[PDB]
Design a protein around this nucleic acid. Structure first.
Lengths: 66, 66
DNA sequence: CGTACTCCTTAATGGGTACG
DNA sequence: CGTACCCATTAAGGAGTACG
């Protein structure tokens, strides 16, 4: 499990998720649609082997990823 | 926003949420139904004035509550 | 790559009642 | 309180196709 394997946009999403934001907010913050946010979240989760955005959030925090 | 206003059961659930567990898992871990878990979750979310379990997860890690 | 859809399914949430 | 259900909704996830 390494954050470097993700793309820049995917890390953009991960950062906002670890800050507890729902997809709709992430989209507005990034000026992209929720649909696109969902694609990134999905890719990030499969590539990081996390089961959900919460695991993703807890990971970032415990492993001091950002 | 203080963790002491919550009940013991509620803190049990928040601790498990902060570890990234979904309601179904929390229920199996505590040996209660998902229904009861959800009740504890929404109560906790209203008392702590948090919008979602992710916020609760991030809050717990930032404020090093556990 | 990142954008933005389709479709479908499951998780999560917010309100209510009830009762040892 | 803690348990457990009812109702209803939105949020989230997992797959696919498409295109500059």
């Amino acid at each position: 499990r390494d954050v470097n394997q993700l793309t820049p946009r995917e890390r953009d999403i991960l950062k906002l998720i670890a800050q507890g934001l729902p997809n709709k907010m992430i989209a507005r913050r990034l000026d992209i649609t929720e649909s696109t946010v969902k694609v990134h979240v999905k890719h990030m989760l499969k590539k990081m082997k996390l089961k959900s955005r919460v695991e993703a959030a807890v990971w970032v925090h415990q492993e001091r990823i950002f």
